[PDB]
Amino acid sequence: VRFLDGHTPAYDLTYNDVFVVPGRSDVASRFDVDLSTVDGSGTTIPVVVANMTAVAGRRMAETVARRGGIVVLPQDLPITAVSETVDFVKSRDLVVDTPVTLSPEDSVSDANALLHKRAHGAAVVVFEGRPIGLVTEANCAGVDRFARVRDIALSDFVTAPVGTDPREVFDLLEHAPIDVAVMTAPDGTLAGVLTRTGAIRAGIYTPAVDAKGRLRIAAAVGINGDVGAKAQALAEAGADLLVIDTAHGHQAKMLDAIKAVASLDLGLPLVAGNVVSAEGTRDLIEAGASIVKVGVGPGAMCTTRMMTGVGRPQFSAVVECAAAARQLGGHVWADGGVRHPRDVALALAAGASNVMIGSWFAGTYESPGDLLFDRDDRPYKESYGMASKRAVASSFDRARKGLFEEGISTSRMSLDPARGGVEDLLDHITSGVRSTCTYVGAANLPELHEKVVLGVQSAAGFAEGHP
Amino acid sequence: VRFLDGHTPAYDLTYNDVFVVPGRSDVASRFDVDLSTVDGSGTTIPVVVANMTAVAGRRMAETVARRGGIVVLPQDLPITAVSETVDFVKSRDLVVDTPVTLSPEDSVSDANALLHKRAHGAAVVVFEGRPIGLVTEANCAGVDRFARVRDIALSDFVTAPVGTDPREVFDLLEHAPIDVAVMTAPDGTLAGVLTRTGAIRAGIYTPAVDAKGRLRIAAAVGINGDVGAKAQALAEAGADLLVIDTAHGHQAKMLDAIKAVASLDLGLPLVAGNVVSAEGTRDLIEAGASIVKVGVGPGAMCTTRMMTGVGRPQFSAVVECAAAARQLGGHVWADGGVRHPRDVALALAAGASNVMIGSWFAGTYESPGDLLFDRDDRPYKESYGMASKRAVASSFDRARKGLFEEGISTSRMSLDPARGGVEDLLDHITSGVRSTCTYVGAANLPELHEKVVLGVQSAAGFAEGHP
Amino acid sequence: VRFLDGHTPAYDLTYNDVFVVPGRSDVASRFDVDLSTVDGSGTTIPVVVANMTAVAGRRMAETVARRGGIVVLPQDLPITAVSETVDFVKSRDLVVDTPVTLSPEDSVSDANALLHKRAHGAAVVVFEGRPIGLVTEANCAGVDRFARVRDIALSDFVTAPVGTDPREVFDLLEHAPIDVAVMTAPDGTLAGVLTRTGAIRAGIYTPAVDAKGRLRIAAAVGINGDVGAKAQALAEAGADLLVIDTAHGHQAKMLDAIKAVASLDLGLPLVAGNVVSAEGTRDLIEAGASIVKVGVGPGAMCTTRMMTGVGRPQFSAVVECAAAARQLGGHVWADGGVRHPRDVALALAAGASNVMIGSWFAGTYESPGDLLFDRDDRPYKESYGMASKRAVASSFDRARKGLFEEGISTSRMSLDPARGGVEDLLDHITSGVRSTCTYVGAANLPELHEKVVLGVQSAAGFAEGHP
Ligand SMILES: Nc1nc2c(ncn2[C@@H]2O[C@H](COP(=O)(O)O)[C@@H](O)[C@H]2O)c(=O)[nH]1
Numbered sequence A, B, C: 001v002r003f004l005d006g007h008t009p010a011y012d013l014t015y016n017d018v019f020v021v022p023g024r025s026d027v028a029s030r031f032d033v034d035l036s037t038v039d040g041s042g043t044t045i046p047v048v049v050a051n052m053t054a055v056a057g058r059r060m061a062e063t064v065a066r067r068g069g070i071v072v073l074p075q076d077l078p079i080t081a082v083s084e085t086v087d088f089v090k091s092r093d094l095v096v097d098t099p100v101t102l103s104p105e106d107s108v109s110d111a112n113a114l115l116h117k118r119a120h121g122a123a124v125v126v127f128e129g130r131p132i133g134l135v136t137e138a139n140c141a142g143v144d145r146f147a148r149v150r151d152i153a154l155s156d157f158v159t160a161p162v163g164t165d166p167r168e169v170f171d172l173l174e175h176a177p178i179d180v181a182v183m184t185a186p187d188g189t190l191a192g193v194l195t196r197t198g199a200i201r202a203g204i205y206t207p208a209v210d211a212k213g214r215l216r217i218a219a220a221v222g223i224n225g226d227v228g229a230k231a232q233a234l235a236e237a238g239a240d241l242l243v244i245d246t247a248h249g250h251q252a253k254m255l256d257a258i259k260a261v262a263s264l265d266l267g268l269p270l271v272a273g274n275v276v277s278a279e280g281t282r283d284l285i286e287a288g289a290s291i292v293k294v295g296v297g298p299g300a301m302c303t304t305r306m307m308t309g310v311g312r313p314q315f316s317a318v319v320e321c322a323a324a325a326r327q328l329g330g331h332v333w334a335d336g337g338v339r340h341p342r343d344v345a346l347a348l349a350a351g352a353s354n355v356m357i358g359s360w361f362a363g364t365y366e367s368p369g370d371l372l373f374d375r376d377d378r379p380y381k382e383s384y385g386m387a388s389k390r391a392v393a394s395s396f397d398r399a400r401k402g403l404f405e406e407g408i409s410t411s412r413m414s415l416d417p418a419r420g421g422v423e424d425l426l427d428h429i430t431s432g433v434r435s436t437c438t439y440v441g442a443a444n445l446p447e448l449h450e451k452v453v454l455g456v457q458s459a460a461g462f463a464e465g466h467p
C-alpha cells in the first residue's frame, strides 16, 4: 500500500500508529459510496461478527445479516442448535426485525429480562398468533415481579400491514408514544416489529442475502476431529459460509483441514486463519482457501501476547497478508484489535477484503449473553474468549490438558446508555468507513485500497482530536 | 537472531518492545515439545530461582527441583545452613511433596502460620512418625489461638502407599473432601503428601535429578574474600551447580574468581555474571566459565538504573550475549526483568540457554519469607534486594561502607488469591513457553532459537490483547 | 394488673416504659408452658398476622396456621382471591410445608426469584405430579438466566413417604447435603417438603385447626359499603374468623357494622377495632363483638400520631381495655407497636388475650411482597400501610377524597441474613413468651395475666442489657 515519503519505520505498526492522509475527492456525500465486499462472502457492509460464543447468536446473526454483514456461528456447537439457528435466521423478514414475542402467561420478571434481548425497547404480548399488547420499562416497573403479563397494563401499539414502505411507517411513528410499530401479516398474524430508526435504516443498508433471498449466515469449525465430516454436515445444515478457525493457522493440521474441505467441493467460500505472515497466507491459499483470517494476538480477548510473546501488530500483518493474497488472488479478513471505527477503516485501507469485529459487539443488546448490571447501574455484558474452542486437541487426560490450557479470559464490555444496540454500533462503523471513503475520495472498497495513502504517527499523534 | 525485514531500531529493545512472529508449525500440541535445557545445568524446564534470600529457600529448592528447574542458594549464607538445606533437598521424594509436618504438641497459632508454608492447603499432624490427622483453614478457624493441635478436630485423610501411580491417587482424590493425600512408607511411617494437581503435574514435568537421582540444587558465592575456598567447600557440601554473582560481572575481581574456581577443577558447571556486553561474555568464557548470567539493571529489585544510569534493556543484551557465547561455545542465562511468561519466552527466543525468575517467585507460598497480609486482606510477601551480597567489599569502616551502599529495596509481591503456589506460576510459565514453541513450530529449545523470527513493536503495540 | 408499690406514673406507658418483675416460679422449662389462647380464635400461639396486604398472604396464612397462629386476610380484597386463598390454605398438610413447585419448562430467572418465596432454601422441580429435581442458590447461580430449569443440573433429594414421624425424617436429614426432604404421597405424587428445623418445629408447635382439622384462617372487612353482605359472603367463603377493622373503632359506623354482623348470627367470633379507651371497648362489646382490637397509632406503619396527635401509648391502652373487656367478659387483641418479643410478652402481660404482629412479619420470606435487595445486598422488603382500606369512605370525587387521604407510607423491613423466615421470628417470639412465663412462674396465659407484676422504668432503664 502507498505510504508517505520517508516513512519506513523499523517496527510493525498497529492501528494507533497509522493514519490516512485525505486526497483529492470526488465523492460528494457518505451515501455516495457503497460498502459491498468483493471477497464473495456477500456482505454489503465490511463487518463480520466473530465466531465467539459470547458474540455470535441467532439474534445477532439475523440483525447483522439484515444490516448487510455476515455472522460466523461459534465453533464446537451442537449441530442441532446450528440447524435451529440457521432455520430461524433464514425465516426472517428482510426488512422487519423479529421482536420479543411474549405469551400472555409469562411472568413480569421474564418480560422485564426479555425486554433487553432486543434494541427495540418494547416487547410484544401476542395471543394465538395475534398481537394484543406492548410492554416496556415503564409499565413493567412497580408491578409485582411474578404477576402475569396479561395484567401488566398492556399499552396500545401502531399496527401496519407487511409491505408498507418505510416512509409510511416512519410518518406513522412521528408522534407515536412507543417508537416501535407492529408489522402484521395479511391474515392478521404478527410478522414482526419495525422501529423508527429501523425504518430509517431499512433504506440505507441493503440486507445481505443468498441466491434464494434469505439472510446470509456462516458457521465455524475447528481442526481437532474429523474436519471434513463436520464441514459437510454444516454445509448441509444451510450455512452459507464456512470458517475454519484455530489459534495458529500455519500448522500442518490447518493445511490438512483446508485440503479436506476443498476436496469436499462444497461450493461455499473458504475461510481459514489465523496467519500473520505472508508465507502463512500463501500456504493457506495453496491449501484451497479463498479467504484468509489474519491476526493472532490483537484480539481484545486474546492472551497469547502476554503469555507467549507471539503475535504481530494488526495493521502491518493485515497489509502484508493482503498484499500476498492479492498477489495470489486471495482475499483477507482482518480479525482482532477492533475497538473504534478507525480500526475498521484502517483495516480496510491496509488491503483487507473485510474486517471482523469480535468482542466489541459483545457489549450490545443482541449479543448471546446475559445483560448484567454493575454497582453504578451502568449496563454491561461479559465477553469470554474461545480458549480451547480455538485450540488444537478420561478424567486424567481431561484435567491434564486443562491444566496447561489458557484460561477463559473475561472482560466487561459496557453498554452505551443510549445507543446500546448493535444497530447503532454498525451505524457508527459504517459512518466512519463512509467518511474515510469520502476523505480518500473512493467510490468503493477496492478504490479505497487503491487510492489510500497512509502515514506513520507517534504516541503524541494519537492524542490529537476529541477522544 | 532472525528479525523482520526493515527492522533495525536505533535503540536496545526490551521484552515489551519485541514480539515473535509465528511460522510454519509441525508441533501438534504443547505436550509435544520438550523444555530440557542444553546448558548442562540439567533443568528440564527453563526456569531458575534467583540467588535471592527472599526467593531461594529449602522449600522452593525442593519444589522447583521436583518440577524440573534448578534453584541457586543465596550467597553469603552460613555453610552449615547450606549443608542442612542440601541434605534436606537431596532426601526428598522425586514425586511426593514434603508436607507441613505438625507435632501434636504444637499450638493452633503455629499450625495456622505453618499452613501457608506450602501450597497444599493442609498440614499433617503426625505422631511418632505416623500421620494421625489433617488440619486446614476451616477446622483451625474459630478455635482458641493457643489451644493444642491435638484438640483442633483433626479430619480424616486419604492414605495411600508410596509407589502408587498418579492415576490411582488421582481417582482416589476425585471426591475427597481434602485435596491432599498422604503417601505413607511401607512400614507405615509418613513419607509425604501428594495433591490432586500434584498428581496431575507428576506426569507432565520430569524432575531434575543428578547422576545419583537426587533433586538438583545450586548455590552462589560472591567475589569478596577467598572465592576458591568457598567454592570448594560448597562443592563438597553437595551443591550440583556453582553460581558466582556480583553487581558488575566484567571487573577484574570477577575474572580472578572465575579463574580460581576453574583451576580448582571441581567438575561442576560454571556460572558467572552479570555482563550485558559481548566483550564481557568473551572475557567470562575465556576465564573458565561455561554459563554466563546476563542482565544488570532489569531486575525488579535492581536500583542501579535509577541511581547510576547504568544497565541495558534486557532483550538486546540477552540476544547479543547469547550470540557471543554461542560463537565461543558458551551458554547464557537471562537474569532480571521477568514478570510475565512472555518475558521467559522472549529470553529463550533471544538465544539464552535458560532464564532466571527472581522476585516474581518471591510472591509464592514456598518462598523463604513471611506471608504478610495487607489491609484489604489480599495475601502478599515482601521481596528484598541482595544489595551488599551482590557487591564487592571496625564500626567506623562498617558504617562508612554502609553509608554509600545502596539500600535494601523492598517490594510487595501480591499472592494470587487462587493460584498462589509456585507450582501454578511454573505451570503458567511452562504453558507460555510451550505455546511459543508451537507458534514458532519448534520441537525443542535449540529449535526455538533457530526457527524464531522476532519483530519490533511500538508502545501501542503492547496494548493489543487482554492484559 | 398488679404494679409495684409506689408506681403511679402521671403518663400512659408504652412497652419500653414497663418491665416484668420475676416472681416465685414452679415452671421448670419453657416447654412446660402452653401458649393456647382463650379468646376463642383457636390459636395455639399468641401471634396474629395483621390484615395488611403487605404481610397477609396465602403463604404466610398457611405457615402461621401450621405453627399455631391465625392470619387475618387483608380487607378490600376480591372475594374470588379470598376463596382461592382459603381453599389453598384449608388443603395444606398439618405437618408438611408446601414447597415452591417448579414446572420443568420454567426459566432459570423464575426459579431463582421463586426460591425466596419460602424459607426452605430449595425449590422442587416436579414433572407430571412426581418430584424429579431440586434447585437452590448454588446450582442456579452462574447458568444463563433464561435457560430452562430442566437443564439447571438438578440435584438429588431425600424422599420419604407422608406419615413418617419427624424423628425419622430428622435423622434422615442429619448428613443430607440439602436440608429439605420431599414428603411424597403413597401413590408417589409429591405432597410437600419438610425441613430439618421444620421436623424440629413439628413437635414443639401444635397447628391451629378448626373443627374439621384444617388450618384456621381469618379475613377482614371494612365499614364502608354493605358490611353485612360482605361478612356473610366471607363466612360462606370458609373464613374461620371475621375481623372488622377501621382507623377509628369508636365511631357510630363501627357500632352499626358490629350490630349487623352480630344480627347475622354467623357463628364465627367477632373482632372489632381499634379503640384505645375503656368506653370504646364497652361500646364494642355491647355492639355484639367478642374480641376487641386495641391500638391506634403505635403501628409501625401508622402515621396518625404525627399528622393528628391522636393515639395512645400501647401498653396503657392495652391494659385498660383488657380490664374493661374482662369486666364485661370480652377479650382483647393488642395491635401495633410490636418490634421485639418483649412487646408481645408485655402485651400478653397487660391482659390482652392475643397480640397481632403487623409489619414486623412483612420482613420475612413468606410475606406477600417482592424480596428486593439494597445496595449493600442486604435482603429486605417493603412494608406499606393500609391507608384508605382502614378508613371510612367519578374522577372529581375520587381525586378530591384522595387529596386529603393519608399517603400509603412505606418502610424498609430488613431480612435477617440467616434467620429470615417467619418460622424463626415465630420461634423468637414464642421463646420470649415462654421465658416470660417461666420468670413469672405461670403455666398458661391466664396465669400469666394473673401472676404478672409490672414496674415502671425510665429512659436509662431501657439501656440495661444487650440490645
Ligand atoms: N418468551 C420468549 N423468550 C424468548 C424470546 N426470544 C428469546 N427468548 C429467550 O431467550 C432464549 C434464547 O436466547 P438467545 O440465544 O436468543 O439470546 C430462549 O430459549 C428464550 O428463553 C421471545 O421472543 N419470547
Ligand SMILES: Nc1nc2c(ncn2[C@@H]2O[C@H](COP(=O)(O)O)[C@@H](O)[C@H]2O)c(=O)[nH]1
Pocket (backbone or CB within 6 Å): A050, A051, A052, A247, A274, A295, A297, A298, A299, A300, A301, A302, A303, A304, A335, A336, A337, A338, A356, A357, A358, A359, A360, A384, A385, A386, A387, A388, A390, A408, A409
Ligand atoms: N488466542 C485466543 N484468541 C481468542 C480467544 N477468544 C477470541 N480470540 C480471537 O480474538 C478475536 C476477537 O477479538 P476482538 O476482535 O474482539 O478484539 C476472535 O475472533 C479470535 O480470533 C481466546 O480465548 N484465545
Ligand SMILES: Nc1nc2c(ncn2[C@@H]2O[C@H](COP(=O)(O)O)[C@@H](O)[C@H]2O)c(=O)[nH]1
Pocket (backbone or CB within 6 Å): B057, B058, B059, B099, B100, B101, B102, B103, B106, B114, B117, B367, B368, B369
Ligand atoms: N513444625 C514444623 N515447622 C516447620 C515445618 N516446615 C517449616 N517449619 C518452620 O519453618 C522454619 C523454616 O522456614 P523455611 O526456611 O523452610 O521457610 C523451621 O525452622 C520451622 O520453624 C514443618 O513441617 N513443621
Ligand SMILES: Nc1nc2c(ncn2[C@@H]2O[C@H](COP(=O)(O)O)[C@@H](O)[C@H]2O)c(=O)[nH]1
Pocket (backbone or CB within 6 Å): B050, B051, B052, B247, B274, B295, B297, B298, B299, B300, B301, B302, B303, B304, B335, B336, B337, B338, B356, B357, B358, B359, B360, B384, B385, B386, B387, B388, B390, B408, B409
Ligand atoms: N543491583 C542489584 N541487583 C539486584 C539486587 N537484588 C537482586 N538483584 C538482581 O535482580 C535479579 C532478580 O530480579 P528479577 O528477576 O526478580 O526482576 C537477581 O537475580 C539479581 O541479578 C540488588 O539489591 N541490587
Ligand SMILES: Nc1nc2c(ncn2[C@@H]2O[C@H](COP(=O)(O)O)[C@@H](O)[C@H]2O)c(=O)[nH]1
Pocket (backbone or CB within 6 Å): A146, A147, C057, C058, C059, C099, C100, C101, C102, C103, C106, C114, C117, C367, C368, C369
Ligand atoms: N411456578 C410457581 N409459581 C409459584 C409458586 N408459589 C408461588 N408462585 C408464584 O407466586 C404467585 C403468588 O404469590 P404469593 O401471593 O403466593 O406471594 C403465583 O401466581 C406464582 O406466580 C410455585 O410453587 N410455583
Ligand SMILES: Nc1nc2c(ncn2[C@@H]2O[C@H](COP(=O)(O)O)[C@@H](O)[C@H]2O)c(=O)[nH]1
Pocket (backbone or CB within 6 Å): C050, C051, C052, C247, C274, C295, C297, C298, C299, C300, C301, C302, C303, C304, C335, C336, C337, C338, C356, C357, C358, C359, C360, C384, C385, C386, C387, C388, C390, C408, C409
Ligand atoms: N392509621 C393507619 N394504621 C395503619 C396503617 N397500616 C397499618 N395500620 C395499623 O398498624 C398495624 C400494624 O402495625 P405494626 O403492628 O406492624 O406496628 C395494623 O394492623 C393496623 O392496625 C395505615 O396506613 N394507617
